[PDB]
Amino acid sequence: VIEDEKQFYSKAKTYWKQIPPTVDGMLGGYGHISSIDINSSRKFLQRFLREGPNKTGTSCALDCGAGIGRITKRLLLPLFREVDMVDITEDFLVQAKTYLGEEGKRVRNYFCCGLQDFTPEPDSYDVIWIQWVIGHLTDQHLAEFLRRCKGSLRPNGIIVIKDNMAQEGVILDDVDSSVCRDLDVVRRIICSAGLSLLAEERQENLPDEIYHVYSFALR
Amino acid sequence: GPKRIA
Ligand SMILES: *CCN(CC[C@H](N)C(=O)O)C[C@H]1O[C@@H](n2cnc3c(N)ncnc32)[C@H](O)[C@@H]1O
């Protein structure tokens, strides 16, 4: 599906450089679902943060493919003492400082890196959130990145992937230079990283016309 | 973000 790997990455970088650093820019015209998205994410995550036996901590989270901080602002900062962000697009990290407002003072690092080149620091994160970005990595780079994420989790920490699933196979989007993979492909890549699947949910009440969205909690 | 089915 991906013929030229260098062009797969360079075309995506070029695409994102000219997108407006706004919520509707992040979501490709679907800004009107942002809060519906975040509310489901919060319910999916909060189970793991409950006092419980092996509770996931609330000290630090990493937001991967964070953009301007849409998720950091309304999902992660209210739940974690500190948040780090990583994104390839410099204009989005610059805008995040303004978009996040006062509570953005609790964002520690604004890492500018492609996930395929990024190593999260060992024993650093209670939650690593990876939303709407796995389609920008090749299958091998995705598996390798997920393995590096596993090494950066604190005790009881989790990785969450939330993304679009194709009906069947792998579909390349030539506009933004990303792939949409079917559920069985995604589950296979997750397993290959040595991650166990702890929770899984298809999101409800999104628009009829978009691909299904699944969330996976992993460790 | 989300994607309209192609
Ligand atoms: C919906 C697509 N996201 C928007 C931001 C965020 N995920 C959200 O609001 O839901 C795409 C983000 O992914 C960044 N990006 C593209 N490609 C990469 C790579 N290889 N590594 C890290 N980040 C990447 C985009 O810049 C965008 O912010």
Please give the resolution of this entry in Å, rounded to 1 decimal: 1.4
Interface residues of chain A, partner chain B, Cβ below 8 Å: 26-28, 30, 33, 132, 164, 167, 171, 173, 180, 206-207, 209-211, 213
Q: A40 to chain B, minimum CA–CA distance in Å?
A: 15
Among the listed residues A212, A208, A205, the one whose alpha carbon sits nearest the alpha carbon of residue A38: A205
- Residue whose structure tokens are 């589950």: A187
- Please give the interface size between A and B, counted as residue pairs whose CB atoms are below 8 Å apart: 30
| Pick from B2, B4, B6: CB nearest A171 | B6
Rg (CA), chain A: 16
Residues 6+ apart with CB under 8 A from A87: A65, A66, A67, A93, A111, A112
List, edge to edge, every strand of the sheet that includes A82-87: A107-112, A82-87, A60-64, A125-131, A153-165, A212-218, A197-202
Contact A96, A72 (CB under 8 A): yes
d(CA A62, CA A126): 8
Bridge partners, residue A179, by sequence = A172
A203 assigned ligand-binding residue:
no
Helix (H, G, I), strand (E, B) or coil at A22: coil
- Residue whose structure tokens are 């975040």: A38
Bridge partners, residue A216, by sequence = A161, A200
**Strands A178-181 and A170-173, sheet pairing:** antiparallel
- What's phi and psi for A50, nearest 5 deg? -60, 145
Total tally of structural domains belonging to chain A: 1
Contact A59, A83 (CB under 8 A): no
d(CA A107, CA A117): 21
**DSSP classification of residue A51:** S
d(CA A51, CA A55): 6
A150: tokens are 């596993």
DSSP string, A114-133: -GGG--PPTT-EEEEEEES-
Helix (H, G, I), strand (E, B) or coil at A148: helix
- Residue whose structure tokens are 């296979």: A188
Residues 6+ apart with CB under 8 A from A81: A58, A59, A60, A106
Q: What is the span of the domain harbouring residue A202?
A: 1-219
| Residues of chain A with C-beta less than 8 angstroms from the C-beta of B3 | 28, 164, 173, 180, 210-211
Q: How many helical (H) and strand (E) elements, i.e. helices and strands, does chain B have?
A: 0, 0
Residues 6+ apart with CB under 8 A from A43: none
Q: List alpha helices for chain A, DSSP H.
A: 5-17, 23-26, 34-49, 70-71, 90-99, 139-151, 183-192
For residue A119, is it left (φ>0), alpha (ψ between -120 and 50) or beta? beta
User: What angle do helix axes A183-192 and A139-151 make, rounded to 10 degrees?
Assistant: 50
Residue A67: CB within 6 Å of ligand 1? Answer: yes
Among the listed residues A178, A161, A171, the one whose alpha carbon sits nearest the alpha carbon of residue A127: A161
Residues 6+ apart with CB under 8 A from A15: A175, A176, A177
d(CA A43, CA A140): 31
Q: Do A27 and B6 touch (CB under 8 A)?
A: no
First to last CA, chain A: 29
Helix (H, G, I), strand (E, B) or coil at A47: helix
Bridge partners, residue A82, by sequence = A60
d(CA A156, CA A41): 19
A138 assigned ligand-binding residue:
no
Residue A43: count other Cβ atoms within 10 Å of its Cβ: 11
